[PDB]
């Protein structure tokens, strides 16, 4: 499984994208939204990406993602399944009209091989 | 007491909140006179009034009758065969929209 990573540094507003595949991407298969994991264990030359010194034992947390067909993930839905539900706000629906509700296809919480993009932010 | 009719009130009092003389009911609109032809249901009567209708083509008349269901307060307690006065009111049931306010001639 190949994951395309979007790493966001909250102390700068700057983000970097790298691609990670192989045994490294296998560990990340199974974590939900809102849980941390050290970057040294995940395996990344972090100081090279941003050109900045970093504190030791830093870590990152999973914030979101998109699947192979282009559908995003929803924090409030459990598991890795894909669903089609009626929405009025939140991730996966931009309303455009007062009280508008629309049915949309969305993903779940657990990471899966179908997922492509993974958005995380650095937590010092 | 007067309720705008100009007629004498009943002999005795009652506790019915749906009574226009001793309760909170209000009367407004048409006032009809008729004859009772049924009194079986509790506190309900049927009143029938006759009138003539003109047929223009035949220059003659025919007789028609109007039947109305009305509420019968306990202080009045009208029965079959007597002449009554009835007054229009707010809806009281599916078919009842009038109240008996006086017996004119006991049968």
């Amino acid at each position: 499984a190949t994951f395309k990573l979007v790493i966001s540094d909250p102390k700068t507003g700057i983000a970097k994208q790298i691609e990670i595949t192989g045994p490294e991407a296998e560990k990340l298969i199974g974590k939900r939204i809102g849980d941390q994991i050290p970057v040294k264990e995940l395996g990344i030359n972090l100081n090279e990406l941003f050109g900045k010194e970093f504190p030791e034992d830093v870590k990152m947390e999973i914030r979101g993602g998109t699947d192979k067909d282009g559908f995003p993930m929803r924090p409030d839905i459990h598991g890795p399944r894909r669903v089609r539900i009626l929405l009025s706000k939140g991730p996966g629906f931009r309303p455009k009209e007062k009280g508008e509700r629309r049915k949309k296809t969305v993903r779940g919480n657990t990471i899966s091989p179908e997922i492509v993009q993974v958005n995380v932010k650095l937590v010092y | 007491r007067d309720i705008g009719l100009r007629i004498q009130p009943p002999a005795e009092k009652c506790d019915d909140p749906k009574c226009p003389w001793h309760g909170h009911l209000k009367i407004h609109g048409r006032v009809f006179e008729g004859i009772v032809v049924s009194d079986k249901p509790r506190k309900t009567v049927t009143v029938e009034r006759q009138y003539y209708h003109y047929l223009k083509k035949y220059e003659r008349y025919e007789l028609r009758r109007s039947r109305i269901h009305a509420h019968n307060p306990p202080c009045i307690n009208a029965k079959v065969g007597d002449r009554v006065l009835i007054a229009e009111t707010r809806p009281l049931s599916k078919t009842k929209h009038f109240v008996v306010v006086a017996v004119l001639e006991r049968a």
Binding site: - | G4, L5, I27, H28
Partner: protein
């Protein structure tokens, strides 16, 4: 109206009291809510454009209104939809003229020229009267407006009396009672625009309205509804009427 308020008005369905050519166009101005009712008033655009002739088109009538050239009951009115009704005063100060709005013998609204002095007063018939918080009295007039009086004055005002009011200051200056011998002007019905004196008053049971007999100048007696009889004087008119 399947789902909401109506906002349009066809010419053919316009009120019968307006002077308007009913087949010349498709649409008429739908008047805005305000003082009088639909049967006794007319939008101000027809006064500026159709009656007086100070403008040819709606666009230049609106420019005249927005500059503040027309006064109704002493106040500047800019809305071309504003309803102008019975007993109002229309004033043009840049030309120095004043009119009172009154119904015709046929029931149509017309403009009656008046003096500059008489333009300061508006008669108001008392339509309703009520108690209000603080134990004061609110008077509700025929043109929809309201006034407050103290509890000590409660015996000097009753429904169907007329109050002469100084405008736009809204100050009372005279109370004209409804009684026998008073002078009245009819505002609605078959005997509209006739005037005279009160002879008798009659009442009926169960909410049917009360009726008045009136003697005119030539000595004839006629009846009308009490609420159609607008007091204008004691034994002579206090305003100029045709």
């Amino acid at each position: 109206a399947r789902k909401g308020p109506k906002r349009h008005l066809k010419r053919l369905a316009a009120p019968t009291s307006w002077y308007i050519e009913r087949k010349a166009y498709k649409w008429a101005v739908r008047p805005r809510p305000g003082p009088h009712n639909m049967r006794t008033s007319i939008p101000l655009l027809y006064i500026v454009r159709d009656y007086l002739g100070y403008a040819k088109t709606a666009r230049e009538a609106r420019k005249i209104l927005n500059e503040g050239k027309f006064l109704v009951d002493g106040r500047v009115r800019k809305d071309y939809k504003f309803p102008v009704g019975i007993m109002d005063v229309v004033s043009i100060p840049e030309t120095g003229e004043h009119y009172r709005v009154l119904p015709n013998r046929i029931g149509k609204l017309i403009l009656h020229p008046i003096s500059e002095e008489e333009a300061n007063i508006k008669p108001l018939r008392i339509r309703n009267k009520r108690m209000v918080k603080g134990a004061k009295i609110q008077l509700n007039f025929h043109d929809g407006t309201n006034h407050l009086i103290p509890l000590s004055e409660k015996d000097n005002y009753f429904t169907s009396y007329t109050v002469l009011m100084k405008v736009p200051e809204r100050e009372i200056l005279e109370v004209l009672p409804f009684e026998k011998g008073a002078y009245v002007f009819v505002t609605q019905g078959k005997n509209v625009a006739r005037k005279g004196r009160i002879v008798e008053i009659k009442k009926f049971p169960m909410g049917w309205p009360d009726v008045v007999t009136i003697e005119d100048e030539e000595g004839e007696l006629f009846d009308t509804l009490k609420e159609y009889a607008f007091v204008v004087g004691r034994d002579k008119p206090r305003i100029s009427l045709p």
